[PDB]
């Protein structure tokens, strides 16, 4: 058989794909549970559990015909029940009943669902999901959504078996392979905290003919031995390896593999820095007084202060800590919405946003939001913004320097360097008598409990956070909605609770930002809708409530996977996250072999996306 071996870094808190919105869960369940549709190797949306589908001429009704060679299996591969249309009724009602953290995906989309969630109704029969028969699912939407079918690639629209739900009770979705049923490409054979995640190909999967690895082993990787990835690839143990140009070894590695180093493209995942606007936990701090803590709570609410940090943050220096100084810019991402995520009038998103910046002051004049460059770093602009921030803050009683807490795993040696680059950059521009980045090195438990796996905003224990967003569906709102005060998926990382809209949120204008998202969402013409979100992204950039840093991709690696064999998706969890369609080979791919395949793939992709948009009309009732 053929095996794919690599590493992972995030143990999941849960397998509950209906309740979670953390990538740590969806990345795994992508290989274990299928939804209505999935991706091919070119980003087209193709059949999955649903073998055919139609949309009504008004775009409000979506009907899906399910194949009937699709079944649920236990973790050991034993057949449990056939997949049926009722499973999608069960899935959506469950996510609603348990107040899923990804309800923003469907709450304002499925007819009557918002009424059901908020208690304005009690009868799920009024919610727009119906099992017409065992093979037929029908969704009724509030308004037309061209990106609706792309939403079915997110796990909150995945099916679940009601009898298994009843039989398991509160044990469903726990971090145990037996806590869920399986209908996707793989079974999960081992899930051991901080040790390994292991998949076995399900031979009775309905699309087993498209699964080309029989085993997938992911070994836990905590960052303390970065040479482990190349060392294991060279020994024949890993199918791939990400390289670290800053490393001791890279000189020898560079010469040994000079014809094999492959650079990926930047993808649609966007990382950015944010501040904690309502910090309540100080277990990890260097501040020793309450005047310091309150002075920091003040500074992060001041826009001039946030812009000073934004302009004092050297992204090239930051990227060089992980990519070497040659590839330092290859990962730079300068918006939350990627610059080419959508096109308006033939010009893409980043250009339009750069034009909307014209109404947000002198410090944005002629800005360029293209990937692969730093338009933000500007020391003298940072010094001017801080001078105004200090005049305004000192009148409030604020004491300087402003101390800002940033956490990092004590094992993450590359991350320690990146965070040290940020401390060095900001303190170099503004002066350590004005700002001090206090680096907090924590255990894995302290890092997760105060950051990514914290369950409340109050538990966030930092002043500065570095997080990221993966698009859930093909519309700019998947990114920009995450800071809205009603249901923002990222709000807690800012120290705010969705549905509370306290005065710190109003002090930075997030209520205004939220109001703009509401008006932008009502727009149904794509060109305007996108232009309205471009204006919103521009507002967010000027606010500097986020400091866009880097994307995924753009990194060097050695590979024994076949180029462009796996599925690809701009949004969702059925693209690179899935080990379906992926193929391994014996020979280390050469740089020239990958480039020839990329050129072939780029041409096949343009033709395939073309025929796919033409096929769409066949599906209208």
């Amino acid at each position: 058989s053929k095996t794919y071996n690599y590493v992972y870094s995030s143990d999941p808190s849960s397998l509950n794909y209906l309740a979670e919105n953390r990538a740590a869960t969806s990345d795994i369940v992508a290989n274990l549970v299928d939804g209505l549709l999935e991706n091919d190797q070119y980003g087209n949306i193709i059949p999955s559990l649903a073998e055919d589908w139609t949309v009504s001429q008004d775009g409000l009704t979506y009907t899906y015909k399910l194949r009937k060679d699709a079944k649920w299996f236990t973790s050991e591969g034993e057949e449990y029940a056939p997949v049926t249309a009722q499973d999608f009724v069960t899935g959506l009602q469950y996510a609603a009943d348990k107040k899923s953290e990804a309800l923003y995906l469907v709450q304002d989309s499925v007819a009557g669902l918002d009424d059901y969630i908020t208690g304005k109704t009690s009868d799920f029969s009024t919610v727009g999901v119906k099992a017409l028969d065992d093979q037929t699912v029908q969704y009724t939407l509030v308004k037309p959504e061209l990106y609706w079918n792309s939403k079915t690639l997110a796990t909150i629209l995945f099916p679940v078996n009601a009898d298994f739900l009843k039989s398991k009770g509160d044990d469903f979705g726990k971090a145990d392979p037996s806590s869920i049923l399986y209908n996707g490409p793989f079974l999960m054979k081992a899930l051991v905290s901080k040790s390994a995640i292991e998949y076995k190909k399900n031979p009775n999967y309905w699309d087993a003919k498209n699964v080309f690895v029989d085993d997938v082993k992911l070994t836990y990787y905590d960052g303390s031995d970065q040479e482990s990835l190349e060392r294991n690839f060279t020994a024949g143990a890993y199918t791939t390896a990400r390289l670290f140009p800053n490393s001791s070894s890279y000189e020898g590695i560079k010469e040994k593999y000079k014809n094999n180093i492959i650079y990926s493209m930047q993808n649609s995942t966007s990382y950015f820095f944010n501040f904690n606007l309502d910090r309540k936990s100080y277990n990890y701090t260097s501040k020793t007084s309450d005047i310091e803590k309150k002075s920091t709570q003040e500074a992060v609410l001041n826009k001039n202060f946030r812009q000073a940090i934004n302009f004092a943050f050297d992204r090239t220096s930051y990227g060089a800590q992980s990519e070497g100084k040659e590839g330092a810019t290859k990962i730079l991402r300068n918006l939350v919405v990627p610059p080419n995520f959508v096109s308006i009038k033939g010009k893409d998103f980043g250009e339009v946003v750069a034009s909307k910046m014209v109404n947000y002051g002198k410090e944005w004049q002629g800005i360029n939001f293209a990937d692969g460059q730093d338009p933000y770093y500007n020391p003298e602009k940072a010094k001017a913004k801080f001078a105004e921030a200090k005049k305004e803050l000192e009148a409030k009683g604020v004491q300087f320097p402003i101390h800002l807490d940033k956490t990092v795993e004590v094992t993450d040696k590359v991350g320690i360097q990146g965070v040290s680059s940020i401390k060095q950059s900001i303190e170099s521009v503004l002066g350590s008598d004005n700002v001090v980045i206090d680096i907090q090195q924590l255990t894995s438990d302290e890092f997760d409990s105060s950051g990514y796996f914290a369950q409340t905003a109050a538990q966030k224990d930092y002043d500065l956070y570095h997080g990221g967003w993966g698009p859930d569906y093909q519309d700019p709102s998947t990114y920009l909605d995450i800071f809205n005060t009603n249901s923002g998926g990222f709000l807690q990382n800012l120290g705010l609770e969705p549905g509370e809209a306290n005065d710190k949120a109003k002090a930075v204008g997030l209520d205004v930002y939220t109001q703009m998202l509401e008006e932008a969402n009502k727009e149904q013409d794509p060109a305007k809708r996108y232009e309205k979100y471009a204006d919103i992204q521009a507002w967010l950039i000027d606010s500097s409530l986020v400091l866009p840093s880097v994307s995924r991709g753009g990194t060097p690696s050695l590979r024994r996977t076949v180029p462009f064999a796996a599925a690809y998706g701009l949004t969702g969890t059925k693209g690179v996250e899935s080990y379906k369609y992926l193929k391994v080979q014996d020979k280390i791919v050469t740089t020239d072999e990958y480039a020839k395949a990329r050129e072939k793939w780029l041409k096949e992709k343009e033709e395939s996306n073309k025929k796919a948009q033409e096929e769409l009309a066949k599906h209208v009732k």
Partner: peptide, 11 residues
């Protein structure tokens, strides 16, 4: 979906 920054150092 919420992405951890950690993953980018092996991805």
């Amino acid at each position: 979906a919420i992405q951890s920054e950690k993953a980018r150092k092996h991805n």
